[PDB]
Structures are given as structure tokens and as C-alpha cells.
UniProtKB/Swiss-Prot annotation, chain B:
Identification of the protein by name: Branched-chain-amino-acid aminotransferase, mitochondrial
InterPro entries (UniProt xref): Aminotrans_IV, Aminotrans_IV_CS, Aminotransferase-like, B_amino_transII, BCAT-like_C, BCAT-like_N, BCAT_family
Function: Catalyzes the first reaction in the catabolism of the essential branched chain amino acids leucine, isoleucine, and valine. May also function as a transporter of branched chain alpha-keto acids.
Gene: BCAT2
A GO CC annotation given for this chain: nucleoplasm
Enzyme class label: transferase
Amino acid sequence: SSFKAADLQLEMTQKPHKKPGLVFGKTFTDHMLMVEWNDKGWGQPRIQPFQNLTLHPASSSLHYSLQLFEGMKAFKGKDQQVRLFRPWLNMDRMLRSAMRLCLPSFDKLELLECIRRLIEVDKDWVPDAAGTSLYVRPVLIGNEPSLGVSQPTRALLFVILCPVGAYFPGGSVTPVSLLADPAFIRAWVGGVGNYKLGGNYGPTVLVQQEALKRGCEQVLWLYGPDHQLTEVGTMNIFVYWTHEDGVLELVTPPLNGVILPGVVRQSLLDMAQTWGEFRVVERTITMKQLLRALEEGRVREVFGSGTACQVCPVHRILYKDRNLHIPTMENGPELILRFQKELKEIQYGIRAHEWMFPV
Amino acid sequence: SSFKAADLQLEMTQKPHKKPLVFGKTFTDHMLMVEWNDKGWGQPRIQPFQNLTLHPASSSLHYSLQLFEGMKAFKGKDQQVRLFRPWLNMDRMLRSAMRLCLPSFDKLELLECIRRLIEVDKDWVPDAAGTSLYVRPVLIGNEPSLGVSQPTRALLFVILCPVGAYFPGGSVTPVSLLADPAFIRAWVGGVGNYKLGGNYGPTVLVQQEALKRGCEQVLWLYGPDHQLTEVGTMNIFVYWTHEDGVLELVTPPLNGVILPGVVRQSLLDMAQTWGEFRVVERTITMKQLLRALEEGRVREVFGSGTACQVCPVHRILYKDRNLHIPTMENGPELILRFQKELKEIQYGIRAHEWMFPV
Ligand SMILES: CNC(=O)c1ccc(-c2ccccc2NS(C)(=O)=O)cc1O[C@@H]1CCN(C(=O)c2ccc(Br)s2)C1
Ligand SMILES: CNC(=O)c1ccc(-c2ccccc2NS(C)(=O)=O)cc1O[C@@H]1CCN(C(=O)c2ccc(Br)s2)C1
Ligand SMILES: *Cc1c(COP(=O)(O)O)cnc(C)c1O
Ligand SMILES: *Cc1c(COP(=O)(O)O)cnc(C)c1O
Ligand SMILES: [Cl-]
Ligand SMILES: [Cl-]
């Protein structure tokens, strides 16, 4: 049985830190959530001051990557009300990751209430300047003090919080360049690339360095012999184009196992479907199709989606030592700006919406 | 700007543990620890076995910036302790470090620090038949940042475990394997050929499935031709008469999906040195194995790795098809020979350049 928010233990900090007057992910708030699991089940969850973890040096979290995480944002409106964006989807994803790594199950609504309580305690850390937010990082790790590759009998679930600045200076989207080299493979069918596991990230650090060495800003992850476009950096990928059949559409790759099911990705699909102005589809996208569409002037916008900046335009792709210009900005970018605006209105509470979870 | 064994700081334990045996749950009294940051490597230290203190944003825990090694030290009858081909583990550890953008170090300095550590804990090294000391070096990223990036801080540590005999009784005991193409350990373009923690966590659930289906370990298949890549966390070997009528030992080649085992390389080296049969690195498919079994051409199938040296296989469940592998009905002659020769080398019965004295 899960830990219960009703059993939450609180210890306030005696070392409150001054708030920022901000690189992503290096500044943390005063408190954290911690819950321990062992052979007698889950202990009581606690909100405690931000502090170090103490781990046995054989901890399976460090030897065999028994580790998963989530990432979601909370936003503060004019009324100083803080709200989480579709957090139930992050909890669903987190539980699926836990099962994949044989880590203990928990109740999604109990964890979400514990997170709400934590954010409520640190509510003053949530910035309210334009484009700013609080990044919420839940983690679940195995913690067996054994070198056996096995299901752990101990685990730790914790949550830390970061205030974050605006991703774009002045809120105005700026496009990125991408390296598209089939040598680099993020994930495989039947693998674990569709789960938010730590193991999926470490190996990309060197690849991103190669991208920079080749004059590109992010990696376009290609898959298969037909060079399917799967993801971009740590974001999902979308293409807005007139398709080979003459119909204007928004396409993103389907959830076939090599795609992480992004919350923003799902939200873009939901939003575009609701408008009912153009075709919205989940279909494989190949470099062959993109090359043709570009030569025929059919591509309007290409962009990544994710919690980091909601949506980010792409203007260049380096493929087979050839630079492809992507005319996203020439096309407004109308759709990107529309999605950005609707998300901003929902996230900051300008428009009421069931997607927002009040703290 | 590597750490140097000459700078080692020794802190002896004031609370030694009583000596003993399940693998990997019992640890010796001391550990090696070295930290890295913007100023480079700090001084290495041998200190009492103790917990790690990690910032909650440590990149080791979020983005799996972590790698490890595994090697054995063996105590001969005159109480001399020796490591088996440790230079190869150091080589592999450095390749792992580079792949995860973790700091380089001098392989001989680490090896000397490890030697010094084992020396301190020498009385933990057992000397009964088939026993050894398992050495577990680890290198982890340790940047207090949620940015997916090259860390500016890292930790290198080494812990030690006394280990009992893998085959209690002394005689090899074979295992059953589940071979289901649904399961994928590694892919070409991935990192399965590096000893990185990320390659291990996802296998836990798969191993549970093997147990549920009545098998002991997983036979990792790859590709449309159902290539046999590895078994459990060991390399795989087949000793058979191939389709061209030639007696041969085959193991899959290092083409990206195979971890380059130290035992694996040693078996190839040993068999090539004997010069009695063909020794090759070539992919092995289930189609070939099926045909070879029907034709009575398979002699032995086994895994190789530090845990057992070599382990016979007697059964493979290939989806719903239960296949007897006649390893034990064939001696298993090759397995016994490898085990004998390795034992002679590892326990100092026969002096050899492969052994590093402590
Ligand atoms: C400044 N960086 C961020 O705000 C950021 C925060 C969290 C994660 C983060 C941390 C862990 C896991 C995933 C992450 N990304 S996400 C899902 O939050 O977008 C990633 C972040 O940004 C990096 C840099 C830009 N980026 C990209 O993927 C791309 C930019 C433009 C294109 Br097109 S792709 C990732
Ligand atoms: C009793 N277990 C061990 O001694 C052991 C030690 C280290 C590692 C260990 C830890 C981390 C990384 C790799 C490991 N294996 S290794 C390279 O030491 O052999 C694995 C160990 O054993 C498990 C159980 C058996 N096994 C197998 O792979 C197979 C048995 C028979 C066949 Br055929 S396969 C793995
Ligand atoms: C987290 C993640 C996504 C989806 O991100 P959301 O923030 O949930 O939209 C996509 N791809 C990768 C690689 C990720 O890590
Ligand atoms: C370590 C390892 C090997 C090879 O092991 P050695 O002990 O070096 O012979 C093979 N496969 C996997 C999956 C491993 O982790
Ligand atoms: Cl944002
Ligand atoms: Cl052994």
C-alpha cells in the first residue's frame, strides 16, 4: 500500500536561502519531499529541508541505473495563485517507469497531493515574471546495498524544485539548428526510450557535444533504415506542412516505442484537434518526405515540444553534410505563436482550464 | 592531470567488521575514494567503508552518469594475492569514462591505488577452492545540476567483496536460458558495448520473465536473424562442428552489441594458442544452432565472465520450443579444460604474465 499524504511529516528549514534577484537546474528551493520504501513498505512521506542523500556505496541506483525521473512546471498567475500543468499525466508516466524498472508502485493521487503540499510550502519561490516558472523534479531510485542485478528491496522517492527563468529573451521564439546523422541512435523498438529513465540521457551527452562541434545546436534523432525523424534534443518533434496528398496537416511521430509520450506533445495534439481547422495526425515522418516537401515548398513549420520552452522552432538541419533550410520563421511562425499564446493563457490562468491543477 | 598513488592518504578503520556467502552483499573494511572537480583530481584515499553523501541533483542519479568495473583477485596457497589481467579492466573503464564524458585518469595510477586497497584488506581475500575477492570500481558524475551536460564534478570509488565458490561442489552445473526475440539488451549505435549502469536496470524485469517461464537466465537475441549475442551478464560461446565440417569455437564479434569481456578475450587467446581447432569471432544465429543440434554437431554452449569464468548451458527455450543443448553429455570437455587452465593461472599454480601481484 502507498504512502499517504494524510501521514505527511513536516520539518521547516532553519536555513532559508534568499530567492534569486539563472541557468536552468542549478538553483533549488528550501524544501524537498522524501519517502523511503523497504520490506515493511512505504514509510511516511516527509517534507524536509533541502539536504543531501546518504547512500550505501553499493546502492543499485549508482551501479545498475535503477533510477527514473519526471519533469513538470508550475506557474504563478497575476493573482499569485500557483498551478501545475496537467500533473496527472506526469504521475501516470512516472508509475509506468517505476514498473519498468521493478521499483515500487505508489498511488498517483497521493504523490500529487504530497507534491502540492511541498510546492505550497515553497510557494514564494515560484517566480511570476513573464515566461518564468517552477520546475518540479520527482525522482525514484533503487537503493539495495547489493551488487546483485536484482529487484531492489529498498527505494527512495524524492522531489526537488527549481525556479526557472524565461527560456526565450523577451518571450520571442528563436530557432535552432539540428544535426541529423543516422549514426546516433537514442532508442530502439522494444527498448526503454519511451520511459523517462536516467539511462536514456547519459549517453546523449557526447552526441550533443558532436552536434556542437559540427556547428549545430541540437540533435535530430533519426531511426530506422528510412531515417525516421523521432525526437529533437530532449523534445518531441512536430511538422506543419501541406502533405503529399495536398492537405494541410500537423504531424508528429506515433508512440511506437522510440518516442517519449510528452505532456506538451499530447496537449498540442489536443489543442489542434479542438480547433478543427486542419488535419492532426500521428504518423512516421521520414527524411525522404521532408526533403521532398522542402523542395516543393510545402513545409511551413518544424518545431520541438517539451516542458523546457513549450515549443521551439527549427530553421536548419544538417543532413548528409548538406544544410537544409527550414522556413519556419518565414511562416510566422504562425502555428508556433498560436500554441505559445494559448498555452501561456492556460498556464498563467488568463483562461480557466481543467488542465491546470491548483496548488 | 591524474591522481597519483604516491599521494594516497590512508585512514584505517576504527570499527572493523567480523569476517564471514551470497554474491555482492558482504563488503570489506575499506574503500578507495577520489573526487574530481574544476581543480582536477583531489588526492586519492583509502578509508573505512562508509556511505556516500550526494547532492539530490547529482547527475549520477538523474541522467545515469555512471559506469563500473568488475574483476577478481585470487589468493594462492602461499597466501600471495593476484589480480587477473587488471590492465584490461582499466582499459575498459577508461573507454566507459570517455563515452559518458567523465574525467580521464591514469590507468596505472588507479591500478596501484587498487593494489594498495586490496593490500590493506588482504585478510578479506579467501583462499578456499573457487573463492576470490571481487573488485568493484565505480566512476560517477556528480554535478548538482539538472542540466543534461558534461559534469564538472565526479567521484571514483572502489569497494571489495569476498566471494564464495560459484559452483558449490566444485563441478560445473548447467543452466537453462529463455530466448525470446522481444527482449533487447543492446543495439548497433547504442552503448551495450560499454559497462554502463544504464545497460543493467532494464534487464531486471526481463530476468523476472525468464524465471516465470521456467528458465534461469536470458539468452539475448538481436536482429532479424535472431543472433545469440550474450547470456545473462556474460559473453556466449559455442563449440561445434560448423556447416563447413570444421571443428570450431565461435563467439560473437565486437560489432557494437557485445560487451568485450576480459574472460571472453582470454578464452579466445587460450584456444588460439593451443592451435587445435578453429577459433573465430562470428555472429551465431538460432537458425544455425537449430540445424547444428539436429545434425548432432553441437558439443558445448557456455557463458563466460568474471562471476563463474565459464558456465555450461543445457537448455534453451526458444519462444515455445524447448531445446536440449548436449553440453554435459560432451564432457563438457572444453569447459573443463578452460576452467582447469584458468584455475592454474589465477591461483598461482602456474606463473603467468596475465596475473598482477598484490
Ligand atoms: C535551458 N534549458 C532548459 O530550460 C531545459 C530544462 C529541462 C530539460 C530537460 C531535462 C530532462 C529531460 C528532458 C528535458 N527537456 S524538456 C522535456 O523539459 O523539454 C531540458 C532543457 O533544455 C535543453 C536545452 C534545449 N533542449 C532541447 O531539447 C531543444 C531545444 C530546441 C529544440 Br527544437 S530541442 C533541452
Ligand atoms: C552468484 N552471482 C555472481 O557471482 C555474479 C557476480 C557478478 C555478476 C555481474 C555483475 C555485474 C555485471 C556483470 C556481472 N556478470 S560477470 C561479467 O561478472 O559474469 C553476476 C553474477 O551472477 C549473476 C547470476 C548468474 N549470471 C549470469 O549472467 C549467468 C549464469 C550462467 C550463464 Br550461461 S549467464 C549473472
Ligand atoms: C521528457 C521528454 C519528452 C516530453 O516532454 P514533456 O515535457 O512531457 O512534453 C520528450 N522527449 C524526451 C527525450 C524527454 O526526456
Ligand atoms: C562485464 C560483462 C561481460 C564481460 O565480463 P568479463 O567479466 O569482463 O569477462 C559481458 N557481458 C556483460 C553484459 C557484462 O556486464
Ligand atoms: Cl516555459
Ligand atoms: Cl570464479
